[PDB]
């Protein structure tokens, strides 16, 4: 009740925690070459206006 | 660190050179050895002792190779050591000398448990 | 090691070499033979110190501990061919040179000269032991368990790296543990702190606190074929001992923190053990056997002064051949009836009486009465940890009343009868069957007689 | 830029509890005009309008966490014995990452936001104690 | 036999479109086992020209 | 002067929305080849008086290559109308 | 068809030599545009229409990243005029120039480069071409080295095995679990480039080896990870052993030579007072080891080789130096005290 | 019988006393060179 | 039929062998109708090296020398077990169609690599084509199910890409169904009382489902008849003759067609149907089951190391 639970809730909580994380980035990249070249944009932006990128 | 796109330069002939019955040159090919046993082993062969003219010139490859690849592995390090001396030998305000104290001088911590 | 490693490598192409079912005898006979040669240049003296030869060897100097290293492959293919014979002669060849073949890294290992030869040797097993995990188990649940046996092993050992790299290129360098003269002491700071735990965390992730424990009945649970690296893991469980050669030295002087790994290692030793009272498969009922007065050597290496190091080299070989024997009268009696609940194996005593020995002088050994290497080594733990407040005697008493109920609960379950059932279960406890069963306490109870071998520095 | 980091590191320590969490509110607050919400929006095309707020609206979602990151910090300096500590700056990281608790129900998510905040919240302050530096040459 | 367990449910839970481990979500297709053509969709009736009173 | 910052304004003609995007993948070519010219005068304005009197055979180069670049892209979009008809950017089949 | 099969291959290597062997920016603009030239061919041999709609994804992304270097020698053409292969004396331009660059190696951002290509290229037969493509940016990063902004070439490492690596536990697709981990061993080399910028060579020889001995493995049948199963016992099971080592090997294990790089590569990284550093890298790819892991541990264990068809006939494919790769892709950790003298 | 092709067979056997005895004289030389510089 | 680059860039096999002698032949039939009372007997005039039809010893029949092993290895639905046409099993005698496919397509891959090598004709007995026919009488008997008839039919579209059509096909001189005689009169004791549904519903699957490739540019020869008896031997052997140059492609379709240039007509058939474990690399079965296609793992995955005694025969040392 508890060597089986509250030491394997808090560990194996990360495999199920990456593999979250793992589905978003498959299952959102789902084509849409409009939307790569959208996002190159973003990219090309924000390393003008963030930091040390110009300096 | 000059006379650049060599593959070893002329200024190698001092050293030693790195001469055989030493165990790399042996463990080159050694792999190699290994390597043509499974050479046959792909293939269905199903010897495992195979066609030896294959499983020689495997032997051949490496040692032969591997000696003209060490020379300039000891060169590269000889050159190494003898800029930094160099370096040492200039500027004797960035490399002071020391004091010899013993342990008469030391009061240390001191932590018994 | 002159050449202990250079016999022992000659071992594996004699085993493809050979001819049909010659394989096994093959391979037992020239294995004993370095038991002479292991004991034979080794054992030398002896005040202040054994340089062996080079930067390979340290000889092991003050901790012996590897004579046992080199008992097991004559000692495991006696014991695994119970149920290894069904499958190809290409794959039986195979089993024999890994096994050999996680021999060959330990006997560097142990010796290891330095701190990074240790790693690197340290981390060299892992690969050998994963595939007797993975493949040759039984059924499922090998599978999960060949990743929780990495990733808390791995996940620990890499933080080393970072440790070692950084001492490497600090204070001179690390590569003898005899230019250990000139050690800096160890201050209370900031990053101080993560430099002795990054150090430390990775020994723990191996002799479990009781904490990430979580992986070791797991890969003994599910287990290969007659506790064939079963007998391996517990040597490998105990060959993380080098926190004996760090932690000695380098950074000497943090007892500062160490109060979270007592405190958690010893209430965690006085709850292991009595969590396991109640189990109903019979491997796993040793299994935390070896949790408990493991995690005892925990709270007798970070208390030092020895009177300790007396008594935590004599318990690193206690249980080394003990817990082994208990895994081997386990991997016996699963041949005959094919379960490990232990509910199953009832109406015996009457069917085998000449392991009825075996069983006793095992269980024996834990209760540990006093003439024996066991409370020789407990009673120098005890009269050690007294001395660091009076109170630890009450813990550790309670250690020794719960394992004393514990021990004969699995003796006591064979003393019963009418036995119900089984039309099988017939053999008698055959001649392989006591030999691979002795050779343990033939040694055992053998040293008790000088056992000045087994001891520190000190 | 990081000269936000040099009008957050220099002057307060500790105490002046409000320009401590007014400054401490921007950088968070700009992270959540960042990539994430980026993507989302490309992703989902919103709509002509509602869309686009619904998009950002979790990125306002998302403001509040520097709102009070500075204000647990900047309280509890100075009411108990008056350095900055690592204990003192501990407290910052659980129930401001309880923010993210409170929102997207708990019980799974919300102590597990508290918990692991509160592992990289004091070793910030914990980096500069020591001087560590993360990007560095020679 | 007896040895482990190579069940058959192991190949069709790796069984490939997406492999999802952690939801099930908008699935690609069964790729093709063969090289990859379906979309064969190339025709058209060609130009009616009279030539007539011209 | 002026005359560099017009043209350096005129360098966005890229911008990346509208250089794959939206359909009728022909408008998003087109950017392509008017990305020359943004680039073949901003040198050619400053060789030029800058007597060089050498690196003014390279504004002559850079357009030799871009066609023949250009040229092979508007090869594939045939290849792409081939198959369908129609090119239509958001033709997507090989998801990533 | 065959002769000019050769010619159009022959020009490829051609190409990235120009790149190499320059003393000026006209000519390693020409040196990789006549890649993004002789690489399309290549692309289409049996014209299938994923494949046509694949090139056309690899194409444009090729040709902004070449646009954009353009762009990047003009403007320090106004600046002092040198145009020798050397710092770029403006930051903004070094800023357009590295993270216009980042997309031909693709890096974190600049992104389905990888995956949508490599995927579903009916030549899996390879598409070991594309290590030249790996190998022309990396020698013009060697001179222009000493003028980077630090953050930027950082920023785009540190985010490329954290998203390299998460990217492909979602997979079943060799193909893709070959594409991905491609970004994360991107991801070690230029984490390392600002801090002497040899020991970035030993990871990309290395690279070369490891990935190149992995593709010919594969030509055999397999396509997908099912596939992957019915070979055990059918092909040849030599080759289910073969195959178990090179992963084990490319993971990082020190008892083999894929952990020859990062032992060496952290010598470097702190000696640089930087600790921080790699110990986020070193626990990331821990999880790009459960790609191979849960790789192994399906040709490894017989998991169900069915629907009974037999080979009873030989294999005659073309295993080209494949007897001499996994013998120095596994047993070389011994023997390189020094491999960074030779090519040092 | 035996049947190899018979052409290649010897090659092999042939280019390493080509590789070896060029090997021998370039380290006989080499071994000399030393003390010739030194 | 090329051997590699080197070889090819000298002499290439494409036409200075098929000087019209390409002419690719196949039969049709119904069962004891055109066996070999008319195929085999035409080799010569016209130099047809002609091929067997069918059996599970096919795989047995090439790689050696060369004796047939016997049907435990080879594990099939055994000619003449199915004849019980088991609508209840385990089973499977669907499995005897995977076989019955991979030994058809192995002649076939074998057919169009004897061509460009030497130059002669072939005919064949029943093409890849033919085994649909059986589909239509095997579903409508209830000893098949769906979920099994999908399969192939998915494996149709995969493994046949490359294959040039037949030429003059022949649909046999055909009876209207006869066949109940002559399948007991011509001996067959375990072909037997198995009534219409299979005899009538295969030969309706002749005409309906064989049309397309029938209205293919390649024209056919077909009769009806008891047999040819010098009635349709040398009508079938003179004006099939003149349809092999003059009267014999329309669309042309199969002629090592107009890539014959070094190109791919011309090397990329005659170097895939070389060196035949590439030609069945797609016949890798299910997803994982489909419940009758199966293998246990390790019993009989058992039964392929007594299968393996030395796994090749014979090579020795030295050489
Ligand atoms: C007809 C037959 C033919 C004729 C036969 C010959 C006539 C009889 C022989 C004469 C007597 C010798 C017998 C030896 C045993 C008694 C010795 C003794 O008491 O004096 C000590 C005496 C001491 O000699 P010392 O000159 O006074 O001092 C020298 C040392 O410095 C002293 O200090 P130390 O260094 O020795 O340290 C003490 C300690 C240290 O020794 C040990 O502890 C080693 C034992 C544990 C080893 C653990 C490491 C293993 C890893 O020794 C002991 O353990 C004593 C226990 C008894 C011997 C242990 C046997 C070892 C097994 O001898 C020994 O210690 C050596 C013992 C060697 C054993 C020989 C094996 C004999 C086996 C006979 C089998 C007979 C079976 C019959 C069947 C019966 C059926 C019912
Ligand atoms: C005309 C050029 C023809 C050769 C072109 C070769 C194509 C490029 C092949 C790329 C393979 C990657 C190898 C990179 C490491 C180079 C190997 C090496 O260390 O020896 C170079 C050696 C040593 O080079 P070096 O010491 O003279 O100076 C160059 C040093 N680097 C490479 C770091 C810039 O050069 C040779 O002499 C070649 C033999
Ligand atoms: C290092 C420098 C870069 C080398 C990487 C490989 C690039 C070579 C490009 C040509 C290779 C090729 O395409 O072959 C595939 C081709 C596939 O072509 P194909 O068979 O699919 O199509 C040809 C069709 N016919 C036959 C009809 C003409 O052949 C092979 O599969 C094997 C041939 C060689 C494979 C590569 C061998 C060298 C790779 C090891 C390099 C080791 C470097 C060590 C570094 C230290
Ligand atoms: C050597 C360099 C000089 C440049 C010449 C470039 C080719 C000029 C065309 C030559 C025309 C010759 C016509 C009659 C040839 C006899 C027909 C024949 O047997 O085929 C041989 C043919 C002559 O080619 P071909 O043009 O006559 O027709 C071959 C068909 N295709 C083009 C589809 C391959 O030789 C070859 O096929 C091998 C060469 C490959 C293709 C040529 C490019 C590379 C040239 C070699 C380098
Ligand atoms: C460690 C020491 C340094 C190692 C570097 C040594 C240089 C490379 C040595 C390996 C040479 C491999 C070789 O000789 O060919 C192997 C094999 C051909 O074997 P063969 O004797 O010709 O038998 C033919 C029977 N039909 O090959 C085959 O089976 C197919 C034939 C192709 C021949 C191989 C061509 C490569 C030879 C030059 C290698 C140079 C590039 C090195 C790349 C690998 C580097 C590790
Ligand atoms: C948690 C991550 C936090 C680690 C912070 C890094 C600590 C550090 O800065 O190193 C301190 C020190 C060297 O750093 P520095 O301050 O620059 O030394 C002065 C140089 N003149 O001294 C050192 O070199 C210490 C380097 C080894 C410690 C790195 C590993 C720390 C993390 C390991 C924790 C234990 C395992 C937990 C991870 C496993 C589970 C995921
Ligand atoms: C003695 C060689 C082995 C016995 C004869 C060969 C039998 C054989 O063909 O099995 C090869 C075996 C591969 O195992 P596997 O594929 O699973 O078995 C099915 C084989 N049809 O195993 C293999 O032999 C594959 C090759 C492995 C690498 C060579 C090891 C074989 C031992 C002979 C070389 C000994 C010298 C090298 C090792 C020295 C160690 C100090």
Same mark, same amino acid.
């Given at each position: 009740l508890l060597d089986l639970i509250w030491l394997e809730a808090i560990l194996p909580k990360t495999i199920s925690l990456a593999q979250m994380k793992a589905s978003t980035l498959v299952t959102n990249q789902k084509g849409l070459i409009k939307l790569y070249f959208l996002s190159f944009l973003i990219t090309i932006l924000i390393s003008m206006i963030l930091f040390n990128f110009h300096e | 660190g000059r006379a650049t796109f060599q593959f070893l330069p002329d200024e190698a002939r001092s050293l030693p050179p790195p001469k055989l019955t030493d165990p790399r040159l042996a463990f080159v090919g050694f792999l190699g050895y290994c390597s043509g046993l499974i050479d046959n082993a792909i293939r269905r062969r199903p010897v495992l002792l195979a066609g030896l003219h294959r499983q020689l010139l495997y032997i051949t490859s490496f040692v032969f190779v591997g000696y003209y690849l060490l020379k300039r592995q000891d060169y590269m390090y000889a050159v190494r050591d003898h800029d930094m001396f160099s370096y040492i030998k200039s500027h004797p305000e960035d490399f002071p000398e020391k004091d010899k104290k013993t342990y008469g001088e030391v009061f240390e911590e001191f932590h018994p448990v | 090691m002159l050449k202990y490693i250079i016999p022992t490598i000659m071992l594996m192409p004699l085993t493809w070499l050979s001819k049909n079912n010659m394989i096994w005898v093959n391979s037992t006979a020239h294995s004993l033979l370095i038991s002479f040669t292991s004991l034979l240049l080794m054992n030398q003296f002896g005040d202040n110190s054994l340089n062996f030869s080079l930067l390979f060897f340290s000889d092991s100097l003050s901790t012996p501990l590897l004579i046992l290293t080199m008992w097991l492959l004559p000692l495991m293919l006696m014991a695994s061919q119970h149920h290894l014979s069904k499958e190809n002669l290409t794959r039986k060849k195979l089993f024999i040179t890994m096994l050999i073949s996680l021999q060959l890294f330990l006997i560097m290992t142990f010796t290891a000269m330095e701190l990074i030869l240790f790693y690197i040797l340290f981390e060299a097993t892992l690969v050998p032991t994963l595939i007797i995990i993975t493949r040759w188990g039984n059924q499922t649940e090998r599978l999960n368990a060949g990743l929780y046996f990495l990733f808390y092993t791995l996940a620990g050992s890499l933080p080393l790296l970072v440790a070692l790299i950084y001492i490497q290129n600090t204070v001179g360098s690390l590569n003898f543990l005899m230019l250990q003269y000139w050690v800096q002491p160890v201050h209370n700071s900031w990053s101080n702190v993560f430099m002795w735990l990054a150090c430390m965390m990775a020994f723990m992730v191996k002799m479990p606190l009781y904490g990430l424990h979580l992986w070791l009945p797991k890969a003994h649970v599910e287990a290969p074929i007659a506790g064939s690296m079963v007998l391996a893991a517990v040597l490998l469980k105990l060959g993380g001992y080098g926190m004996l050669r760090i932690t000695l030295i380098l950074n000497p002087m943090t007892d500062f923190m160490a109060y979270p790994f007592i405190m958690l290692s010893l209430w965690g030793m006085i709850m292991t053990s009595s969590i396991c009272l109640r189990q109903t498969d019979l491997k796993s009922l040793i299994a935390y056997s070896s949790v408990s007065h493991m995690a005892l050597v925990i709270v007798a290496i970070l208390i030092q002064t020895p009177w300790s190091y007396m008594g935590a080299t004599a318990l690193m070989i206690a249980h080394g051949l003990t817990s082994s024997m208990l895994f081997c009268l386990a991997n016996s009696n699963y041949e005959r009836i094919h379960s490990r609940t232990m509910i199953l194996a009832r109406g015996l005593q009457t069917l085998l009486p000449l392991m009825a020995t075996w069983w006793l002088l095992a269980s024996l050994t834990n209760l540990a009465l006093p003439p024996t290497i066991n409370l020789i080594g407990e009673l120098f733990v005890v009269m050690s940890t007294f001395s660091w407040s009076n109170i630890t005697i009450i813990l550790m008493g309670v250690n020794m009343v719960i394992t004393a109920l514990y021990s004969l609960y699995m003796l006591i379950m064979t003393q019963r009868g009418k036995y119900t059932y089984h039309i099988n279960n017939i053999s008698p406890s055959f001649t392989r069957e006591n030999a691979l069963m002795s050779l343990h306490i033939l040694p055992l109870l053998l040293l008790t007689l000088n056992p000045k071998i087994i001891l520190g520095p000190l | 830029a990081k000269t936000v980091l040099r009008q957050y590191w220099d002057i307060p320590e500790g105490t002046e509890c409000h320009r401590k969490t007014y400054a401490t509110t921007s950088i968070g607050g700009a992270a959540g005009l960042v990539v994430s919400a980026y993507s989302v929006a490309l992703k989902t095309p919103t709509s002509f309008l509602e869309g686009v707020a619904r998009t950002g609206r979790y990125t306002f979602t998302a403001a509040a966490i520097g709102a009070i990151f500075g204000l647990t910090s900047c309280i509890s300096a100075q009411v108990r014995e008056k350095p900055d500590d690592p204990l003192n700056y501990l407290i910052g990281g659980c129930a401001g990452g309880l923010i993210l608790g409170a929102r997207t129900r708990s019980y799974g998510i919300g102590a597990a936001a508290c918990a692991y905040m509160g592992l990289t919240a004091a070793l910030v302050k914990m980096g500069q104690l020591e001087g560590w530096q993360v990007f560095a040459e020679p | 036999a007896r040895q482990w367990q190579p069940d058959v449910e192991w190949a069709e839970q790796y069984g490939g479109a997406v492999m999802y481990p952690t939801k099930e979500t908008a699935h690609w297709k069964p790729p093709p086992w063969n090289d990859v053509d379906p979309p064969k969709d190339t025709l058209v009736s060609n130009l009616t020209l009279n030539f007539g009173p011209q | 002067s002026m005359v560099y910052m017009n043209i350096m304004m005129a360098f966005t003609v890229s911008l990346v929305g509208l250089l794959m995007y939206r359909s009728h993948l022909m408008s998003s070519l087109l950017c392509l080849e008017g990305m020359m010219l943004s680039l073949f005068v901003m040198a050619a304005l400053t060789i030029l008086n800058s007597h060089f009197t050498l690196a003014s055979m390279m504004p002559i180069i850079l357009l030799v290559f871009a066609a023949c670049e250009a040229a092979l892209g508007l090869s594939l979009l045939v290849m792409v109308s081939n198959t369908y008809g129609t090119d239509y950017v958001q033709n997507l089949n090989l998801l990533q | 068809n065959p002769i000019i099969f050769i010619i159009i291959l022959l020009t490829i290597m051609l190409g990235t030599i120009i790149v190499m062997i320059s003393s000026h920016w006209l000519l390693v603009w020409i040196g990789f545009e006549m890649n993004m030239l002789a690489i399309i061919p290549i692309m289409m041999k049996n014209h299938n229409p994923r494949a046509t709609e694949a090139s056309t994804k690899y194409f444009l992304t090729q040709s902004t990243a070449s646009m954009l270097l353009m762009m990047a020698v003009i403007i320090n053409l106004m600046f002092s005029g040198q145009w020798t292969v050397m710092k770029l004396f403006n930051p903004m331009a070094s800023m357009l120039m590295t993270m216009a660059l980042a997309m031909k190696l693709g890096m974190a951002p600049f992104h389905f480069w990888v995956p949508e290509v490599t995927q579903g290229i009916p030549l899996?037969?390879?598409?070991?071409?594309?290590?030249?493509?790996?190998?022309? =940016?990396?020698?013009?990063? #060697?001179?222009?080295?000493?003028?980077?902004?630090?953050?930027? %070439?950082?920023?785009?490492?540190?985010?490329? *095995?954290?998203?390299?690596?998460?990217?492909?536990?979602?997979?079943?697709?060799?193909? !893709?679990?070959?594409? #991905?981990?491609? *970004?994360?061993? /991107?991801?070690?080399?230029?984490?390392?480039? @600002? #801090?002497?910028?040899? /020991?970035?060579?030993?990871?990309?020889? %290395?690279? *070369?080896?490891?990935?190149?001995?992995?593709?010919?493995?594969?030509?055999?049948?397999?396509?997908?990870?099912?596939?992957?199963?019915?070979?055990?016992?059918?092909?040849?099971?030599?080759?289910?052993?073969?195959?178990?080592?090179?992963?084990?090997?490319?993971?990082?294990?020190?008892?083999?030579?894929?952990?020859?790089?990062?032992?060496?590569?952290?010598?470097?990284?702190? !000696?640089?007072?930087? *600790?921080?550093? =790699?110990?986020?890298?070193?626990?990331?790819?821990?999880?790009?080891?459960?790609? #191979?892991?849960?790789?192994?541990?399906?040709?490894?264990?017989?998991?169900?080789?069915?629907?009974?068809?037999? !080979?009873?006939?030989?294999?005659?494919?073309?295993?080209?130096?494949?007897?001499?790769?996994?013998?120095?892709?596994?047993?070389?950790?011994?023997?390189? =005290?020094?491999? @960074?003298?030779?090519?040092? | 019988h035996g049947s190899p092709n018979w052409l290649k067979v010897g090659l092999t056997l042939g280019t390493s006393v080509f590789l070896w005895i060029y090997l021998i004289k370039q380290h006989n030389e080499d071994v000399l060179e030393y003390k010739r510089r030194n | 039929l090329q051997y590699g680059p080197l070889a090819y860039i000298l002499g290439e096999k494409a036409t200075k062998k098929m000087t019209e002698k390409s002419k690719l032949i196949t039969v049709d039939g119904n069962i004891c109708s055109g066996k070999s009372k008319l195929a085999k007997e035409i080799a010569e005039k016209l130099g047809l090296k002609h091929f067997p039809e069918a059996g599970i010893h096919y795989v047995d029949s090439t790689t050696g020398d060369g004796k047939p092993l016997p049907v435990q290895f080879s594990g099939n639905c055994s000619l003449e077990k199915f004849y019980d046409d088991p609508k209840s099993n385990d089973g499977n005698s669907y499995r005897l169609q995977a076989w019955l496919y991979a030994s058809r397509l192995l002649q076939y891959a074998d057919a169009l690599e004897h061509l460009l090598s030497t130059g002669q004709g072939v005919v064949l007995e029943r093409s890849i084509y033919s085994d649909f026919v059986f589909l239509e009488a095997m579903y409508r008997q209830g000893f098949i199910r769906k979920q099994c008839v999908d399969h192939y039919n998915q494996v149709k579209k995969v493994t046949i890409c490359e294959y040039l059509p037949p030429h003059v096909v022949v649909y046999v001189d055909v009876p209207v169904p006869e066949v109940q005689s002559r399948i007991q009169k011509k001996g067959n004791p375990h072909e037997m009382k198995i009534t219409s549904a299979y005899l009538q519903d295969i030969e309706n699957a002749y005409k309906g489902t064989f049309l397309p490739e029938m209205s293919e540019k390649c024209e056919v020869l077909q009769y009806s008849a008891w047999e040819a008896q010098d009635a349709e031997k040398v009508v079938e052997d003179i004006e099939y003759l003149k349809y092999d140059k003059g009267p014999w492609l329309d669309q042309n379709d199969r002629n090592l067609h107009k890539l014959r240039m070094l190109v791919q007509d011309k090397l990329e058939v005659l170097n895939y149907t070389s060196i035949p474990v590439f030609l069945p690399e797609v016949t890798v079965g299910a997803h994982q089951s489909d419940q009758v296609f199966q293998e246990f793992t390790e019993l009989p995955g058992r039964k392929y190391r007594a299968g393996y005694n030395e796994d090749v025969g014979d090579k020795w040392i030295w050489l």
């Open positions: - | - | - | - | - | - | 899996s037969s390879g598409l070991i071409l594309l290590t030249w493509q790996k190998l022309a =940016p990396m020698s013009v990063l #060697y001179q222009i080295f000493p003028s980077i902004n630090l953050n930027l %070439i950082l920023t785009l490492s540190v985010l490329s *095995i954290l998203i390299g690596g998460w990217g492909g536990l979602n997979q079943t697709q060799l193909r !893709k679990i070959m594409a #991905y981990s491609s *970004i994360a061993h /991107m991801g070690w080399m230029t984490a390392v480039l @600002p #801090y002497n910028p040899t /020991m970035t060579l030993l990871n990309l020889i %290395i690279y *070369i080896i490891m990935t190149s001995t992995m593709f010919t493995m594969f030509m055999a049948n397999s396509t997908t990870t099912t596939l992957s199963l019915s070979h055990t016992w059918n092909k040849t099971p030599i080759m289910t052993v073969l195959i178990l080592a090179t992963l084990l090997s490319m993971g990082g294990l020190p008892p083999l030579s894929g952990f020859m790089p990062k032992w060496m590569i952290i010598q470097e990284m702190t !000696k640089n007072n930087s *600790i921080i550093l =790699p110990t986020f890298m070193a626990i990331t790819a821990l999880l790009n080891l459960y790609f #191979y892991m849960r790789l192994t541990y399906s040709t490894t264990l017989t998991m169900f080789p069915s629907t009974n068809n037999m !080979k009873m006939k030989w294999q005659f494919p073309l295993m080209k130096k494949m007897t001499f790769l996994p013998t120095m892709v596994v047993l070389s950790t011994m023997m390189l =005290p020094l491999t @960074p003298m030779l090519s040092v | - | -």
